[PDB]
Amino acid sequence: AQTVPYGIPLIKADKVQAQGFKGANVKVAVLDTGIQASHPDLNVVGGASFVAGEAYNTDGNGHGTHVAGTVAALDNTTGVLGVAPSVSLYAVKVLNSSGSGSYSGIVSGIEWATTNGMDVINMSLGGASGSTAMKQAVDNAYARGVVVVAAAGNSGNSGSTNTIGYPAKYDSVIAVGAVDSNSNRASFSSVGAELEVMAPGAGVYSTYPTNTYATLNGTSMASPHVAGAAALILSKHPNLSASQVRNRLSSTATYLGSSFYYGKGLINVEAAAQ
Ligand SMILES: [Ca+2]
Numbered sequence: 001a002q003t004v005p006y007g008i009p010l011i012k013a014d015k016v017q018a019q020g021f022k023g024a025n026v027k028v029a030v031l032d033t034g035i036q037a038s039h040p041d042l043n044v045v046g047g048a049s050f051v052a053g054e055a056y057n058t059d060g061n062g063h064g065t066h067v068a069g070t071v072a073a074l075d076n077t078t079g080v081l082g083v084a085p086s087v088s089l090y091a092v093k094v095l096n097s098s099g100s101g102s103y104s105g106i107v108s109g110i111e112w113a114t115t116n117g118m119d120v121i122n123m124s125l126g127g128a129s130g131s132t133a134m135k136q137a138v139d140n141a142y143a144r145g146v147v148v149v150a151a152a153g154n155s156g157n158s159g160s161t162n163t164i165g166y167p168a169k170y171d172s173v174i175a176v177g178a179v180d181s182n183s184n185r186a187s188f189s190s191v192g193a194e195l196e197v198m199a200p201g202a203g204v205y206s207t208y209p210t211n212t213y214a215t216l217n218g219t220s221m222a223s224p225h226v227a228g229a230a231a232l233i234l235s236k237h238p239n240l241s242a243s244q245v246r247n248r249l250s251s252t253a254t255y256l257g258s259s260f261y262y263g264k265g266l267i268n269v270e271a272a273a274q
Contacts (some may be wrong), residue, residue: 001075003213006181007070007200011225012247012270013083016066016232017075021273023084023231025238028071029118030224031109031125033099035091036209041079042068042089048112049093049230050105058242060097060184064210066216067124068136069207070224071231080206083228083269084235090118095125103131110137114144122227123150123268124220126190128164135170142172147230147242151219152177153190157261162192169194170202174246183254189219196263197253199225229269236273248272 008014031046037057038046042065049056059065072082072089094109095101104144106125113121114137117233121141142148148167152175155163178201179188186202189195189220201222208214226249233245240248250264252271 001079002079003205004081005205007204007225008083010181010183010200011083011229011267013228015270016236021232021236022075023087023228023235025088026084026120026231026234027088027090027118028120028122028227028231028232029090029092029113030064030071031092031094031113031121031123032067033061033095034059034064034093035068035096036065037091039065039207039211041073041207042072044089044091047091050108051093051096051101054093054097056091056093061099062214063099063220064091065089065209066206066214067122067220067224068128070204070221071122071228073207074225083225086232087231102158103134107133107137110141114141114146118146120147120227120230121149122224123225124165126151126153126168128165130166130170134167138167138170139172142242145242148173148243149223149227149230150175151223152195154188154219155190156188157191163190164194165190165193174226176219176223176226178219179266181258183266185256186217188217191261193260195259197226197250198256198262198266199223226267229267229272232269233273248274
């Protein structure tokens with residue numbers, strides 16, 4: 001009855017879980033298209049919306065629901081399993097139904113998360129340009145003790161071209177690139193100097209609008225795996241800081257090749273978790 005996406009085992013999230021660490025008491029904010037809060041495999045505890053005319057608890061685009069799924073689909077007898085199923089989930093709608101949003105809605109969501117005490121911020125979501133405001137929000141949030149994770153981008157590689165997007169490019173933010181179930185880098189992952197870690201991003205099965213499950217591809221799918229991994233670590237060592245959580249993830253990642261295409265490699269929550 002319950003399915004275990006290949007992604008959880010690959011990052012060895014299952015092993016931290018077996019020890020009894022599942023992100024209990026860790027507050028994760030998912031900055032996306034919202035979340036079908038009525039899905040039976042999810043438990044959204046709150047949030048807000050920065051998008052005109054849409055609450056935060058409806059998702060007219062499946063995207064935000066799928067990502068919310070990778071972090072926290074409940075541990076039960078139905079649907080899927082999230083990396084940190086006992087997390088406190090907040091849906092912050094910063095993107096519209098068609099998948100786009102303004103810097104201003106985006107910076108609003110960041111600020112709401114910092115302010116409301118969120119421990120992790122997932123932004124599956126990129127842009128070719130940053131702003132001064134954005135950099136400020138992210139830096140500040142990070143400085144204020146929040147672990148900020150973002151999708152690196154789906155721009156592939158072209159020679160020695162850096163293709164990493166905003167906000168992943170900011171050094172206070174963890175840029176996540178994508179691998180498949182054979183730990184091979186996916187073609188769509190952005191490349192560049194700022195790439196930090198890899199997570200499963202190809203053929204990820206998760207929660208999808210109207211009480212169902214679907215498979216999606218993208219760096220967007222990769223990022224929540226890392227947000228989840230952060231929450232696992234924190235439930236084990238609640239004393240750790242954002243930079244300490246960050247160093248654990250990158251310094252214990254499985255080496256896959258050149259940093260340009262892979263960062264420090266594929267995350268290993270068991271080694272990271274200590
Ligand atoms: Ca489930």
